[PDB]
């Protein structure tokens, strides 16, 4: 339901977006380094409004994912941590910048703490420090601060230091089952139900140990949606890495199920980010559709660029619909994105979309190419993007050109068909069509009208076209070989006829008559020529038979004018008039023998001229 051309604003981002999509394909083909996310990051940062900031952060989410082997849970946590860390940098060692964030926003104007029961050592809430270090991804710093405070945390928490070192010195960020059972017992016996317990201490225990998965949120320290997302993401394990699945478990699907069950109602100005961070990529695309088709389409391209994946091919072919006619080349640019998913049906779906674009817009020269002045083909945009099509083939291009050609012929688009058959390199068919077009022009265009005007060209004028095809093809051994010898001959004969018609139109009677005799079609020679040419008539090519009537009319008319000219002196005027009258006579006898295969008016036109001689 989107129409890109309906206003300056809605048309300016389209080309701005299409231009990114364009150099993406360029690096795609050039095997380059282009990164679409940071291009949309650049354009989206200047704009604003809430959805734009929403969209802007979503691309920064996609950008962070780049060059990372993609584990949904891991990249999601890395995003939320690096964002918080940079937040504490914007606000201002990392440890001292987090310390200052703590002293600032955890304290009321009294210098009182907003959270009660904080364990405070030298004015530093050490469990809040450990926690926010973890919240920033600074695991080794977080373990560090716990270590320095070993002499200030009694013995109940002393054991926790060993579980932390273990959690920190690993890659799985999991604990050996002997540790997770010990830590869970200690959590249940001392921490979980503590009366005056520090809430950050409880959060850190729960995060490091995955203690008590029945309660996933610590609301007292969950100060933002990002915190809620991070804390859940922190608790997810793979199914095959659950130490005690019948007691408790938490997987990514569990996390996605509750995000879905809550819906956007519970996710404020953050639902698109939440869907993206939870790995619900289709839902994030679908949600984006509710407010901007253009940004939805392009977010899908971003997600396809990352191999993350309504259906891509239909997403891309639907976006194209409002500008297929207006902008055929950029339509190709988006249809070619269909092979980002690299699927067995994706390649075929992209082919069928391209074929539909060509057959429907009939934009043959931009999409399929055109013939240069020398006869050499200039590639169209589909051909220029052939690498991106993953073609086994160039067979595809050939096949679509031939289909457009037969449709052209069926529709009566003669010029289209001649252009397409040239592109398909169907050279004998081209000369066949050109001969048919020139022959029909010569026989059907009223005789006294001119055939070529000062502003006619080789693309649309039948005489100028045939001349161009003869010049660029017949003297090209590679091409000329492929044109039947008689099709070449019919072409040159028709062209000689068109030269005769021009001389005639220009009142060059004598020279018209001389070129006429060189055709070797009419009986100029003697009495018996009429009989010979009459017999030949039934064997003439279809292209020629229909032009015999005008040739007879030109001949009789040229003789009639030349006899008047001779009678208005010279020694042998009589012999030249007798000779001319002889040609008229032979032509009239020939004409009378073939006249019932001629138009019914031809003979009558002819003999009315003959008796004036």
């Amino acid at each position, epitope marked *: 339901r989107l129409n890109v051309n309906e206003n300056n604003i809605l048309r300016e981002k389209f080309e701005n977006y299409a231009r990114i999509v364009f150099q993406f394909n360029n690096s795609r083909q050039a095997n380059g380094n282009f990164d679409i996310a940071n291009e949309f990051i650049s354009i989206l940062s200047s704009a604003n409004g809430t959805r734009n900031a929403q969209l802007l952060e979503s691309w920064k989410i996609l950008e962070s994912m780049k060059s990372k082997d993609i584990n949904i849970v891991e990249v999601g946590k890395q995003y939320l941590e690096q964002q918080f860390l940079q937040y504490t940098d914007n606000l201002y060692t990392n440890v001292n910048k987090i310390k200052s964030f703590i002293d600032t926003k955890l304290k009321k104007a009294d210098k009182s703490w907003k959270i009660s029961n904080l364990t405070v050592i030298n004015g530093v809430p050490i469990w809040a420090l450990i926690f926010y270090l973890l919240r920033a991804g600074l695991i080794k710093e977080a373990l560090q601060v716990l270590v320095e405070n070993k002499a200030n945390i009694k013995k109940v928490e002393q054991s926790f230091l060993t579980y932390f070192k273990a959690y920190a010195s690993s890659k799985d960020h999991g604990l050996p089952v002997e540790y997770s059972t010990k830590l869970h017992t200690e959590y249940n016996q001392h921490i979980k139900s503590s009366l005056d317990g520090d809430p950050y201490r409880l959060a850190v225990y729960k995060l490091i140990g995955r203690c008590d998965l029945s309660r996933k949120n610590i609301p007292a320290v969950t100060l933002s949606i990002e915190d809620w997302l991070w804390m859940h993401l922190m608790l997810i394990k793979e199914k095959d890495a659950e130490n005690d699945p019948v007691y408790e478990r938490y997987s990514l699907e569990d996390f996605q199920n509750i995000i879905i069950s809550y819906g956007p109602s519970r996710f404020s100005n953050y639902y698109l980010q939440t869907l993206l961070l939870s790995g619900l990529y289709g839902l994030a695309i679908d949600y984006t559709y509710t407010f901007s088709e253009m940004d939805a389409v392009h977010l899908a391209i971003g997600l396809a660029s990352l191999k993350l994946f309504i259906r891509f091919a239909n997403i891309l072919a639907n976006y194209t619909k409002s500008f297929r006619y207006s902008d055929p080349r950029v339509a190709v640019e988006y249809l070619v994105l269909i092979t980002l998913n690299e699927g067995p049906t994706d390649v075929e779906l992209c082919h069928e979309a391209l074929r539909e674009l060509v057959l429907e817009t009939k934009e043959f020269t931009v999409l399929l190419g055109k013939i240069g002045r020398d006869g050499a083909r200039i590639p169209g945009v589909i051909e220029e993007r052939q690498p991106l099509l993953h073609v086994r083939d160039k067979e595809f291009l050939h096949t679509i050109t031939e289909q457009a050609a037969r449709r052209a012929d069926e529709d009566g688009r003669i010029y289209d068909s001649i252009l397409l058959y040239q592109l398909a390199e169907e050279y004998d068919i081209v000369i066949t069509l050109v*001969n048919s077009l020139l022959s029909d022009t010569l026989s059907a265009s009223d005789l006294d009208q001119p055939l070529v005007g000062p502003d006619d060209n080789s693309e649309t004028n039948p005489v100028l076209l045939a001349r161009r095809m003869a010049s660029i093809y017949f003297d090209n051994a590679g091409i000329s070989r492929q044109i*039947h010898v008689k099709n070449k001959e019919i072409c040159m004969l028709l062209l000689n006829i068109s030269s005769i018609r021009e001389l005639y139109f220009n009142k060059q009677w004598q020279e018209t008559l001389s070129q006429m005799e060189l055709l070797d079609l009419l009986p100029f020679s003697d009495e018996l020529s009429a009989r010979k040419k009459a017999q030949d008539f039934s064997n003439l090519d*279809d292209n020629i038979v229909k032009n015999i009537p005008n040739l007879l009319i030109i001949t009789l008319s040229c003789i009639s004018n030349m006899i008047h000219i001779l009678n208005e002196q010279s020694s042998t005027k009589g012999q030249q008039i007798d000779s001319l009258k002889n040609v008229a006579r032979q032509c009239m006898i020939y004409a009378g023998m073939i006249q019932y295969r001629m138009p019914r008016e031809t003979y009558s036109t002819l003999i009315n001229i003959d008796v004036s001689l």
Partner: nanobody
Amino acid sequence: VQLVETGGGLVQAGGSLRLSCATSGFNFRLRTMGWYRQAPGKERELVASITSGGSTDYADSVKGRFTISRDNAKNTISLEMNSLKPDDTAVYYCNIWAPTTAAITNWGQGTQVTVSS
């Protein structure tokens, strides 16, 4: 495309035969068409060809004796063969004319023509 060659069969030397080919499934009018023969052992060779407009051209082998024609209304091609010789015995195929016979790769079943004596 489909090429249904009929006509022909066995005939005594010096006799006459008329081959025909009913076509379907392509636009007949725009194509130069040809009649070919394939003698046992020998390769398939071009015997006669005809442009869209009815202009014809013949191999020396059959000049004066064979006559190719076409009917663009009925989408048929025909080959009248007169004063036949046993050297003309072969299977005869009708197909689009092309400069090098090997490249066709899209034919019909053909009609066998055999001339005795």
